[PDB]
Amino acid sequence: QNLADPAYRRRRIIMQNMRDEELAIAQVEEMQAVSAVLKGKYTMTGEAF
Amino acid sequence: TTAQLLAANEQKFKFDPLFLRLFFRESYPFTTEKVYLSQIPGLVNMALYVSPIVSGEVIRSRGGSTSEFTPGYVKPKHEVNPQMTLRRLPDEDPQNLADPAYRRRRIIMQNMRDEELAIAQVEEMQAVSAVLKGKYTMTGEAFDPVEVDMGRSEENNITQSGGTEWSKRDKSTYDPTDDIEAYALNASGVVNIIVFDPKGWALFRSFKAVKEKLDTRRGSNSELETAVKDLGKAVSYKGMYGDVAIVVYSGQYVENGVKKNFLPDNTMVLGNTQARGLRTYGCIQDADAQREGINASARYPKNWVTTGDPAREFTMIQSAPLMLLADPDEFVSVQLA
Amino acid sequence: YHGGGSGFGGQLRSWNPPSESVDAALLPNFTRGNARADDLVRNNGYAANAIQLHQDHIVGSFFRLSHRPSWRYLGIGEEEARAFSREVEAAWKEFAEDDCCCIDVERKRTFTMMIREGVAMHAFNGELFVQATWDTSSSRLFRTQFRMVSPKRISNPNNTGDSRNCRAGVQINDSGAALGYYVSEDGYPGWMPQKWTWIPRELPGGRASFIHVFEPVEDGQTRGANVFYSVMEQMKMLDTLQNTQLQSAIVKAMYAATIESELDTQSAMDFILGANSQAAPVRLGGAKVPHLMPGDSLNLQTAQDTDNGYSVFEQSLLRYIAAGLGVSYEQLSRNYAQMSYSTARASANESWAYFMGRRKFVASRQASQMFLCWLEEAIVRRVVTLPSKARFSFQEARSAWGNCDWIGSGRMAIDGLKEVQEAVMLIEAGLSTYEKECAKRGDDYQEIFAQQVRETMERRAAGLKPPAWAAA
């Protein structure tokens, strides 16, 4: 009950997506930080990088 | 060899949405994957005689039925590219003349006109195929086939057969009124309008009794227009015939180059001028359209540039229409062979 | 009529502008025109000066209220009308020029700056939107707060091809009246999804909710046009010419001389320019007489005049720009060349006529509507009490109860003494009253009278000579 038209569902999807990217990048930053602290060096490699 | 363009006409075909206007009002846009229409039987078994001792046979309470439908999608589009702009247009003088930029704003304008006209034709055929017959099927090259099937009793859609053909029986000393009454006996509710087809009207009018119902001092109150009344318009609101209203509809739509008639070759459609009609418009499915916050609308227009080598500024309109008939037994369609 | 024909010798055979309404000739290019006008204001010396002149001359340092309800029409009696005017003026004075700046929801501007910013927005955008809101959670006496909305945020129906009734995001009824506007959200980060809201023009009770101010040109005009469409192109081209001429002058002045020789560059510049090898810098002290072998040579480059008639062309272009915008040429260009008294006075008059027109229309209308919107709230909250036996209620006569006049800053005289003698001479005859002469200096006569009647008391009590205006 109390449904919403798709113009609102699209916005909800958009916010949850943007929060997902922000969390992922924060996680990457923390991963670099821990390796920089626990050890002197860290390697930065990827599949297309 | 100078010149001047004094007159520049434009050609059109006979097009007016009579069937959509009369029977389909109160448009209801919806944001839903599928809509429901619910019918309830309402047949009451007669109270059978029962002895004062047995006291049995409880009666089932009546229960209705429903249906679900999915609206179709339609999207015409056009184009404009710099090549068409340079040469000239058939609607500007050799004198006067304009910069290339304005010819584009004229071509886009006529493209808009053609798009809206095509959508209107789709809506009108959508309505007419729903009035005449219970069901229609929307099919296309890339559109997966989906059909709409309102529940119309087989006893409607009556057509004439080896017997009782108006064409075969004599045009003098016979009545069409009794056949009209026998046909209209089926419809649920009163009938208030009859929508002929020019050939069907010509067949009906030639009867000797129908003339007699018009020129009688005290046997009727009907009045018609037997002579030629309308020759260029697509509608003809002729006079009443006793109680009903007589209408002749000759409207044309084009599929391929040729011109075709909406009403198929002398049909007659009994009906009520206040028939409950539904005009449902679905949800437009376009990413930019939902960016703007627009949904459950009709005629969403847009344009863009394609950044290709020849460029191009396209033009598109999207409708997603679907016309329903809340009660499909308030009409009676007759073939009139 | 040669004007509508081919032209003199066919020169005009390609100038065939389309005969289209103002809307169809403005709306498709609205956003780009607004953006270009903003770019001109933010990055050009003369456009900023023109906006500054608009704000400082039209409105000034203070924009004072003068309330004159029409008592004859209402039949309320002179003394009651005067007392009501005094009470309303005191209430407005306490609410408009406060220090906490609670007239504006953003708590950034007082009333005078709001009027000035409205005139500015009406200058380089041709419209202004003021939204009157409520904050019922507030504990202040007056809960009516105003907000200034940039015309960019009154977006269209999301830029889609629009229609007849819904134009430029301003919903319209069958006639030309406007029913409801569309407001957006200004998101600085640039990633939030945009949301559009509907704000109706008038509340059901008749109160003004969302205000639109502009001056139309033709029969139908949904949104106005700024005063830059006349002269943007010349302004940008003039700026480019200025920068290009400056860079060319610098390039021409950079290369002082030119050494022509056969030997090595280090040796050639060592033996001629005086640079020591112990590229190579040259000391700038003293006078030098180089010794040139037959092969070598020295040339002192000469440059053109740094400004070979550029200032006159600048003069012509600035004259054109000033003619387009509206202000005089001297104020825009700061030239102020030699001129007699008559020429300067004519210049000032020609500017002040337009300034008075703009002030009488835009600032006056905006101030009157805002004042009425506050006055309704003041009346309802019993903070101000209407006279009894009124022929109409406040609802039935909106303007008559609050028919108000505003006094702005007055002119700064070129001749300090001539204006004073003019005012005195007019007062001696019956041609002009005290209010008219005191208002041209932007002062209210009642305050002056009260100040004088306390000054005479102070002078009498302190033991000094009585003033000139005292009655013996």
List chains touching B (3+ CB pairs under 8 A). Answer: A, C
Residues of A with Cβ-Cβ distance to C195 under 8 angstroms: 11
Q: Tokens 């949301």 — which residue?
A: C195
Q: How far is B98 from chain C (nearest CA, A)?
A: 6
Q: What Cα–Cα distance (Å) separates residue C360 from each residue in C59, C68, C350? A: 10, 17, 16
What stretch of H or E contains B114?
Answer: helix B100-132
- A4, amino acid identity: A
Residues of C with Cβ-Cβ distance to A13 under 8 angstroms: none
Per-residue tokens: C51: 């906006």
Q: Are the C-beta atoms of residues B244 and B191 closer than 8 Å to each other? A: yes
The torsion angle over the Cα atoms of residues C171, C174, C179 and C182, rounded to 10 degrees, is 0
- A11, A16, A19: best mutation site toward chain C, by most C Cβ within 10 Å? A11
Strand blocks (E) in C96-208: 128-134, 144-149, 166-167, 170-172, 178-183, 197-200
CA nearest to C348, candidates C409, C412, C407: C412
Q: How far is C161 from chain B (nearest CA, A)?
A: 6
Q: How far is A44 from chain C (nearest CA, A)?
A: 28
Q: Which residue in chain A has the smallest CA separation from B288?
A: A7
- C29: DSSP letter: G
Beta bridge partners of C148: C130
Q: What Cα–Cα distance (Å) separates residue B222 from each residue in A30, B229, B238, C456, C466? A: 91, 17, 11, 100, 105
CA distance B277 to B325: 5
Interface B:C, Cβ pairs < 8 A: 29
| HSE, side-chain direction, 13 A CA sphere, residue B40 | 5
| Three-state DSSP class for residue B30 | coil
Q: Are the C-beta atoms of residues B281 and B298 closer than 8 Å to each other? A: yes
Per-residue tokens: C138: 């507030």
CA distance C149 to C172: 20
Are C191 and A18 a contacting pair at CB < 8 A? Answer: yes
Cβ neighbours of C75 (radius 10 Å):
11
Are A15 and C193 a contacting pair at CB < 8 A? Answer: yes
Q: Where are the alpha helices (DSSP H) in C181-261?
A: 232-254
Per-residue tokens: C255: 């290369």
C16–B contact, CB cutoff 8 A:
yes
Cβ neighbours of C465 (radius 10 Å):
8
| Three-state DSSP class for residue B259 | strand
For domain B154-276+328-335, the CATH superfamily is: capsid protein of prophage domain (3.30.1930.10)
C188–A contact, CB cutoff 8 A:
no
Q: Which C positions 195-234 lie with beta carbon below 8 A of chain A?
A: 195
CA nearest to B148, candidates B157, B133, B137, B156: B137
Are A6 and B293 a contacting pair at CB < 8 A? Answer: no
Are B301 and C161 a contacting pair at CB < 8 A? Answer: yes
Considering only the beta carbons, identify the residue of B97, B98, B301 that sits closest to C160. B301
- B99, B290, B303, B314: best mutation site toward chain C, by most C Cβ within 10 Å? B99
Backbone φ, ψ for residue B116 (5° rounding) = -65, -35
CA distance C291 to B60: 130
Q: Which residues of A touch B (CB under 8 A)?
A: 5-7, 10
Strand blocks (E) in B126-276: 135-138, 146-149, 193-196, 235-241, 244-249, 252-254, 259-261, 268-271
- Distance separating the N- and C-terminal Cα atoms of chain B: 60
CA distance B332 to B133: 9
C385–B contact, CB cutoff 8 A:
no
Q: Which residue in chain C has the smallest CA separation from A8?
A: C195
Q: How far is C189 from chain A (nearest CA, A)?
A: 13
Are C196 and B293 a contacting pair at CB < 8 A? Answer: yes
Within chain A, what is the greatest distance between any pair of CA atoms? 57
Phi-psi sector, C78: left (phi>0), alpha (psi -120 to 50), beta: alpha
Cβ neighbours of C332 (radius 10 Å):
22
C243-255 b/e (C-beta count within 10 Å ≥ 16 → b): eebeeebeeeeee
Residues of B with Cβ-Cβ distance to C161 under 8 angstroms: 112, 301-303
Residues of B with Cβ-Cβ distance to A13 under 8 angstroms: none
Beta bridge partners of C200: C180
Per-residue tokens: B46: 């007669």
| Three-state DSSP class for residue B254 | strand
Beta bridge partners of C133: C145
- A1, A3, A10, A13: best mutation site toward chain B, by most B Cβ within 10 Å? A10
Backbone φ, ψ for residue C385 (5° rounding) = -110, 130
CA nearest to C402, candidates C411, C417, C392: C392
Q: Please, which residues have CB within 8 angstroms of residue A47's CB and are 6 or more apart in sequence? A: none
Q: How far is C113 from chain A (nearest CA, A)?
A: 38
| HSE, side-chain direction, 13 A CA sphere, residue C459 | 13
Are C161 and B97 a contacting pair at CB < 8 A? Answer: no
Q: How far is B323 from chain A (nearest CA, A)?
A: 21
Q: Are the C-beta atoms of residues C58 and C74 closer than 8 Å to each other? A: no
Q: What Cα–Cα distance (Å) separates residue C42 from each residue in C51, C119, C124, C127, C317? A: 11, 17, 11, 18, 20
Considering only the beta carbons, identify the residue of C6, C18, C158 that sits closest to B292. C158
C8–A contact, CB cutoff 8 A:
no
**Entry resolution in angstroms?**
4.0
Q: Please, which residues have CB within 8 angstroms of residue C16's CB and are 6 or more apart in sequence? A: B96, B97, B98, B99
A14–C contact, CB cutoff 8 A:
yes
Q: Where are the alpha helices (DSSP H) in chain A?
A: 6-38
CA distance C348 to C19: 38
Are A6 and B295 a contacting pair at CB < 8 A? Answer: yes
